[PDB]
Symmetry: D2
Subunit: 392 residues, 4 copies
């Protein structure tokens, strides 16, 4: 197939730009020029590009240089037609953030982190970004006695309340997406799962401005079901953005191409995002790839890997649709009673009083006869997989 701008494939500058310096070895690739990145991505089908402040403008650049870079960057976007759907801030690389940005034990670091983000909010607003992604990679601890979690949640809230205030007053119209991750680089990161992140956002001052940006690999690092967590996020209406990549369970963060880790879960995820209610997708934001071309690769492997993300999503999309359109699948869904879950448990107007009065729901209920009937889930799963293998 071919990607269109309507597919909304976006990529971070730090993805195809990863030089491949890992925890145990030096970079295997030279630095990628941002203008070139814009051009290359435009060519493979991306509709947008994203970046951390520090990906674009080197940490500690004078005003002149910074200005210079931005203006060149704006031209490339101009020329190519790419947009900046989201921007983010680096609060994890510099040594000053070793104990965190917003929740550093050190108060002067917290104040500096806020300043660094306000500044990226301005650049973001100016480039037309709609979302501010917040990844607290250094928020957490290696040792339990070293971090007061309650105080850290207070300080986290205190910094987000301010960012919302500022954006609303400046009229930027940004939405904020918190990105949860269980560990790496901290032994334990605060807001470890999509769940913890949604519960937190609900405690903010203007909760309607906050949602989450879950990443496939992050939830899998804890062995959780990504598709199911995204279905919960959509139920809550907090799916503000999504980071797509691959991972092979609980181990270091692999950042593989989307669908190169848990293939069965990548299939069910594409199905959930696209075969939404009223035919239409359940999710309309950017399909953003936050992955890394393997360290064994050169620049050709880099563009190859960029294209693989797109091809994986589109091949899966194609099979998810065929799946839903199959009459045999339709028959299996019916036998499994998948849609019966959508009909309320109670008849319209029934409350506990009427339920209590229904002998058929308890006193005369034959739990044994009901318990003997199978749901046909295995057959239903086998049909999904045969669709994924292109065997039907």
């Amino acid at each position: 197939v071919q990607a269109t701008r309507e597919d909304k494939f976006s990529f971070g500058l730090w993805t195809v730009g990863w030089q491949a310096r890992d925890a145990f070895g030096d970079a295997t690739r030279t630095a990628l020029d941002p203008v070139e990145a814009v051009h290359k991505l435009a060519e493979i089908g991306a509709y947008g590009i994203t970046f951390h402040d520090d990906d674009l403008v080197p940490f500690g650049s004078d005003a002149q240089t910074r200005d210079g870079i931005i203006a060149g960057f704006k031209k490339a976007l101009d020329e190519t037609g790419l947009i900046v759907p989201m921007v983010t801030t680096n609060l994890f690389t510099h040594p000053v953030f070793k104990d965190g940005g917003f929740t550093s034990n050190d108060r002067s670091v917290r104040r500096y982190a806020i300043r660094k983000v306000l500044r990226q909010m301005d650049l973001g607003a100016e480039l037309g970004a709609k979302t501010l992604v917040l990844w607290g990679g250094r928020e957490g601890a290696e040792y339990d006695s070293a971090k007061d979690v309650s105080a850290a949640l207070d300080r986290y809230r205190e910094a987000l309340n301010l960012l919302a205030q500022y954006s609303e007053d400046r009229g930027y119209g940004l939405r904020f997406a918190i990105e949860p991750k269980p560990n790496e680089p901290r032994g334990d990161i605060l807001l470890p799962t999509a769940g913890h992140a949604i519960a937190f956002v609900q405690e903010l001052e203007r909760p309607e401005l906050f949602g989450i940006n879950p990443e496939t690999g992050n939830e899998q690092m804890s062995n959780l079901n990504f598709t199911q967590g995204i279905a919960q996020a959509l139920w809550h209406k907090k799916l503000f953005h999504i980071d797509l990549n691959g991972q092979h369970g609980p181990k270091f963060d692999q950042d593989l191409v989307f669908g190169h880790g848990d293939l069965l879960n990548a299939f069910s995820l594409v199905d959930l995002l696209e075969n939404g209610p009223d035919g239409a997708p359940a999710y309309d934001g950017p399909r953003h790839f936050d992955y890394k071309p393997s360290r064994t690769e050169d620049y050709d492997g880099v563009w190859e890997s960029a294209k693989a993300n797109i091809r994986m999503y589109l091949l899966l999309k194609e099979r998810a649709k065929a799946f839903r359109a199959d009459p045999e699948v339709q028959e299996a869904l019916a036998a499994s009673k998948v849609a019966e879950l959508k009909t309320p448990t109670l008849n319209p107007g029934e409350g506990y009083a009427e339920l209590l009065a229904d002998r058929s729901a308890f006193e005369d209920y034959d739990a044994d006869a009901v318990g003997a009937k199978g749901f046909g889930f295995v057959k239903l799963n086998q049909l999904a997989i045969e669709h994924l293998l292109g065997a039907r």
Copy 2:
């Protein structure tokens, strides 16, 4: 040390009563009489007992049978002075619940599940229970296409709203605690972590009546930090109850005695619960042990294991107290700046305008100098362990 009623140690009838039939073998113990369990627990210092409907009254008992069991039960409670602080319903054993209780794809099962629960609420209210724990062990899936999560969450919510209604109408004054679990017995369970359950609870009709009942091993099954998720539950004010046990990371549910799994996390958990703000505990509900005496033990090992739970908690509490009263630990805490997180990041009355104006927060911030200061976290962790080891 010795447990007092003020310690509020409680046990489920199903813990000391587990006959040890596992997934690969037959029971190794004969059944425990509930009256005998009441007497034995009182004797080791428990203040309360809890139970699933089916633990006390065999599934399908006629009303005469059920009434007799209940009356002998109440007499035992009376005579020993033990109370019933929480009650729960078995929605996982019978074959009828193979696809869940409240979220089974089968509508009639959903209606029966609610009636089973209503009946237990009446019995709980008559025994004086203040909490109803809800463990949706069968709510979930083994295959992604078998379960519509969104419909499932709608059905879950629909059942819970009715229960709150009935309780409030009957004046039962119950609080509801959802217990999260990532998997086992379903491949993937809905509301997998304390975070997911808290975010869900926030969407109910009367959220104030709902909180969570997190279990030590449950979060460890996902390799998450239990103390840190409890800290967040406390921040939201949703810690309605707690299940204490041991686990060795991601593997089947072990249900070891509390402290026999991740000792260091057990230590920091006891510190958090008891050394709360204002001298006083941060949590005041029951300290409930939801564990299982190992399959290798006989009834002597069963009572030894019940006593081990209480001993473990009291020993850790003693060491947590000494930890905080150490002037050396206090000095390490000050050097690591733990308490400085409790100080707002913004000055009183400062807003973004004033922050933007503070050049010390950015323009004149020496990131590099701050970045080089150590936090002394290792040293702090070392003192903590020396206290646990009784080396200090």
Copy 3:
């Protein structure tokens, strides 16, 4: 694609016959009759059936009874043309085995464990079985001080040496396949991975007679690469049998249909076993499915799930073949230097003296230049996945 006797699909009596009684619920299916199972399996294309002693002949059947069952069984075999490639012994269900069979702390259980196996050996011999699978599910511990590992290995060895002695004296011609598992039912099981089992076997008296029976799911419970461990087993020539099934990382043992868990690894595994050395398979034994039909299924679901196992294998085989025959794959394999690994590092007749004299292997070696060339591994991976999805 249809199954042939040449495909060698075998199933354990206990897979399709699993009543779905789990750690938290009652059985949802009635007992399956063995003659019936033989007939049904013959029908779906299985070439063979396997069983634990206790799956066929109920624990404690008198000789008359036992004798009667075997005769019926043999007749069913006869009629369908099904063979018994392997037999095993249940050393895990009965309470006497709660601390192990061969390595129980109790000397009398150890003695009984050996007698139980000798007896099963005679029956296997009688039915023509070639392999004796030994799954030490109860060998291990929940607490480190409870089991002397060293002594346990001595006793595991002592027992196996005796079995081989007996087999050899009697002329049975059996091969012994140890089955590794990291945990469940025990907190930790002795010989936890394929590696630990191979290393152990190398220490017995007649090692040539011993190998392993690795199970997909068991390696995945530790997050290990199953394909990669099978490659190493093949390298040692110790792959005596294989148990195929599915799993979703580290959590309780799921026993899904082969390919329903880690699909990508299921693909690379079939490629490994079938696209062997000549053109021929690298593995010639039974393709044994050790799975469980999900608890939500009735007998229709059971037969569906049996068929699904065969279907997944044949579908993956078909795509593995196509992958290797693609000229584009050939090209990608050439660019990745896969085959270059098969060429010895040293030239024929070269030793350390010659290597040390080669200035080009070090002194004049341009590591920087070599380190800049890509291996093109992502692209190769992408072609593999496209073959899997029937996209090529």
Copy 4:
């Protein structure tokens, strides 16, 4: 407690010397001078130091520089009395090793990797090192089709056989210790566990010169029982060296201080190594710490953490000793029949025929009566923890 040279505590130069540049941030500490490291370690009680070739001599130093550095290092050891018990080679940092050293698909890289190691073997021999540790960190893959595991194992073997040939011919008398790791930095590493490494070594030409160097966190990254694994290594007599550190289950490689991760396992481990047969340790080599001072620390934090390792080991030893010495433990050990596993299952000269003729081992055996006696394991376990906690 005080460390003595008889304690044999060693530290890698790369441990205390780790500049804290992780996968997400820049170094937070300046470079440590080898000579200074030697003086500091000597001072905290270490008896020896280890290093990777590239830790002491910057990759690419001329012989003049190289020589100068060796000379000074040699002086420092001289003055302090420290020895170099082990040396290793860096076959993972430089980009040339992106696909491995010994198993790179590129033949030239393989030749180069051997030369790099021969050279390090020379320096090791000159400094009196007895063990060459081989950590194949880059041997493995991210994708299944990229690496022929069989070919890889052949090439790993080819390289190792040459190394033993050389050492034996030069009369260096070195022992080779393969260090297993499941993942990080490759998606999956060859020889993922202590078990796989032991099985592989048994296939070399001179197997008696080869053993393993297992690392605490490496086995815990797969959620394996480190103590049980060491016990097996000891049974095989392949425990040639050991790397001690801490980890919190399956997540990135943390490298915490020894005992700061799974504390209960750290305890059973010291008990295993120290309370060997007849009072004497079961292990005689270096007690080597391969850990990292947390990124949040400064040089103060660094020295602290170095001492914490010694401290932890000595506190644990002390409690392990007391545990075993407690007549109450002694009594619980007896009741749990731990030592009964040491008695052969078979009587002296007893074979299959005498066992088959013994009615008490089967025919007349009361499995039900034996199946009901408890092992008293929870109680023994609770006694161990109370010793650890200093409460006994």
